[model samples]
Target: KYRVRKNVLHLTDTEKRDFVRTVLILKEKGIYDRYIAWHGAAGKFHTPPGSDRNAAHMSSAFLPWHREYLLRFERDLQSINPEVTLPYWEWETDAQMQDPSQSQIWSADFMGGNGNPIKDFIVDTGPFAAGRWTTIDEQGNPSGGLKRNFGATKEAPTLPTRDDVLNALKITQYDTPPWDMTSQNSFRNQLEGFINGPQLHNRVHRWVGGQMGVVPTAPNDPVYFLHHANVDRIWAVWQIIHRQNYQPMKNGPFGQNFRDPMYPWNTTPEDVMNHRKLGYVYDIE
Candidate 1:
């Protein structure tokens, strides 16, 4: 079950200090490095060079898949310290800023800044800067250090605002056929940024280019969890707005029925259709 998720920016100084220390402990113990490898394996459901795509995104299972993923990740973090559940970043607020990159979140105090011009955008500052940390493969091979570039060289022109998220929430349908990326009118697609209106999830991924922009490995950056927590909160809110509605006939994993297992996890979409049952609620900005 989930623990209540709070706004990352709103976390008090002591909370922030404790959270940072906990993350550092995880990173120091090689637990943090393993998360990236999980994404790599998670992308294909197994080992390398496989054809299986991640069931987490661009598909009908997107919502439930990620709901469970985030839960498991939070559990991992909480094992180190029970005080922390995944926190979220309301990126739209940063989008309104004169320069989102300059936000204190990216300073040397927190996660870190964009990559350098050379070395393929290696993160140059903060706790997770280039040389300080190293990413490892499933077999424990070193890939490289952490990397990111906050909207400097990628898709997001500006983050979507509350209006955009609200518009998507207004859509009545949960999802449609051809349940993959191109699906339209599907609230899932629109939220995933497949539809025309203000992009919800994918746009932010693009704006925070580098590790986050990559499909198979987007989870490489720690910011990914916070961003997606907000996305998950949106799904929870959308359910209340359209309480009578939920997912449609899915063509992929775990049949159209809401009770079907979400794959790799015993929980069903019905199990996650409401956030309260999961043991957490959002502050709901």
Candidate 2:
């Protein structure tokens, strides 16, 4: 694969600077907001009119939907700087830390630190800190600044551990019947973090707090992509171990079927299944 997405810690000092630089350029050009808009748009799109399943999350397409999303964003970064591939935050290993806030990824040069209590949880440090970066509310109106309250919620007090990822990977099925959030023994549901309610991917979102905690406003924080990159890597590892195809190949939601077009885009789950074929590989692989 031509694009190798490395762990955030694996990135050299220059690599980290370049990645942040390219993202800022995309933001200045107004291209970065498109990703935020598209992600929010797809989240509101419910499959079969009433079902909980959507084109992106809460369905079989979760992995592939984000796969394509990251692919497009990575290409945009490439257009700005071909050397800048998306880097992942390996939160599973980060979970081992006594305090994740001390992690290097949150350093001022990279993602910045936790929100300041005096500022009402507004992030006041790092590249994305207040006065440095702007954010959008759910309505697309310009909000003053990004905010974060790490581990502020009772739902996800900490990040998912390496053992948690290992257990989910042990599941052989990609997904199961009636594939929304409740599918049992389902790799998709487990990895999506809905099985025990906000366990893995969802836990990371909640653990980060701020815009990353909510679905629609999550992309506002640049760390969203890094977190999802790790999620995609976990799913990639599952695919290699199980060699499984996506579930609900026939009777699933119209937008979530194997070959059906994901909303807001024509790309199908089948089209983005092979990460290697997409010309990208995670550092672990």
Candidate 3:
């Protein structure tokens, strides 16, 4: 049976203080400087400035990049606050669906509240229309709105509808045996497999038009982390039924032999990586 784990590192006053202080320090020191560096040089994939035509390819990169980034931050935190580990809050449990109104991630002011404690600072230009995404100049720095990719024109694409999700679920190229979803036994196995499998898992991010490795930040749209937590949770469930299959395949992107390496992390392509190594483990019913 599924039960929420009592997140051991629930934020404490001291922990929160340290976290806030560390975040400020990181910002000052440019913790995400590398990602910004990559985005600056790589020229971005979407928003009319890059050659990559598909939004999905760009979006596919967000999750993986962020996962590693967060892990690095968490490790740093443990070094400073050894008694405190990073705790991930499942925002889905708050409202059962994505709620733009939640302040735990998004500030109420961003959502239009006065002095509310539940939200984070709003960007007021990106997809929310409440925030901005200023374009950068040739120097890889902001030169006012002149270079920024702002306004409705640069708005990030919306999440696809249920039909769109279904279409993606039906892609046959990656489906293995027992792919049918109608029959009870087959549906159970295949649905679980699809949810857990790398192909569909990666596809979900691609569908959203995010980069694979970037994690959510204060300026980032709050939905980014929420969506990934659900994806991560699905993987937790998948791990239970497929312990033998948990390892990466011998050949594929991030597989055993690819040497090109994923961006945002200097990690080599063939390295075997798993969630457990990151100091966080999931429980699935």
Candidate 4:
């Protein structure tokens, strides 16, 4: 059975501690990039940033794909401390703020503040924070230190608001042809930021900037999973309202078709449509 995932803003002290402990261990395991990166070949440890992993950032599979990814990660954490589970980040709270950088989520107690003016974007405080970061995807193949500068890389100054999320849920259909990134009115496209629908999922990534903005290595920051966790929850909530549905097998991303096997996972698209099988529900906001 799955445990309830709480909101990042509402986590208990113990839950937060377990969360921190798991992160430090994972870094030590050479899984996530901490203040360093691992090279098995050379038996070397490089400092700051991390290399990108295979993750789908854009396309219809974005939601279902990430659902599987995060659930697996949740399982990893649980293996260490059953009391610790991931939490969601309701970005609207920061998006609407007069200055999002000032949100408590960025304080030393939470995910840490933005990067400083330097060659690297190392975050100086917070859980995984340091001093600065490499501003231009400079970490190369391996990512740079945990870095974030909210709104620094956004095309627009705004983050998705509650209203935007509401409209996205109101969508009736799931996705359409050439569904990779051109689908219209599809909930998948709407949330993926392909269309103006909601300005969600994608906007938050943009607003956070740094590691979260890039593909492959976005998880360099701990907040990445939390952000996607909320997006996954929204997808789950939408499934209930719209009823179960997926894009037609006629056209879409690989494995998005009904019976095709999704990459990095043996399951088919059919397996990921419902969260009930995954054994978890989101905490009520």
| The candidate that achieves the highest lDDT relative to the unseen native structure | 2
User: Which regions of candidate 4 are displaced past 4 Å?
Assistant: 33-55, 118-121, 131-143, 250-253
Tally clashes: model 1: 1
In angstroms, the error of model 2 at 155 is 1.5
What TM-score should be assigned to candidate 4?
Answer: 0.83
lDDT for model 4, please: 0.66
What are the per-residue Cα lDDT tens digits for candidate 2 across 1-285? 878999999899999999999999999999999998998899889998877888889988999999999999999999999999999999999999999999999999899999999989999888888888999988888988898998989999999999999999999889997888888999999999998888999899999998898888999999999999999899888889998789878888798889999888999999998999999999868
Stretches of candidate 1 off by over 4 Å are: 33-35, 45-54, 137-140, 249-257
Q: What's the TM-score of each model vs. the native?
A: 0.86, 0.98, 0.47, 0.83
lDDT of 4 by residue, 155-230 (tens): 7467888888888898888877556455777888888776852268878877777777655456667887888888
- Candidate with better TM-score, 2 vs 4: 2
Number of clashes found in candidate 2? 0
**Candidate 4: residue 70 lDDT (0-100):** 80
Give the lDDT of residue 63 in candidate 1: 78
For each candidate, the alpha-carbon lDDT, in order, equals 0.71, 0.91, 0.34, 0.66
For each candidate in turn, give its C-alpha RMSD to the true structure in angstroms.
3.4, 0.8, 9.6, 6.5
TM-score of candidate 3 relative to the true fold: 0.47
Which tens-of-lDDT digit does each residue in 1-285 have in candidate 3? 221222213444554455445543443455534434443443333323333311112222222334454456555655554553444434324333353233343332221121112222223322232323332344556423211111112222222234433443343222222222221222222322224332233333332332221312222322333344444444444444445232112332231123434454464322323556455654333
Q: Report the backbone clash tally of model 3.
A: 37
Candidate with better TM-score, 2 vs 3:
2
lDDT of 3 at 227: 48
lDDT of 1: 0.71
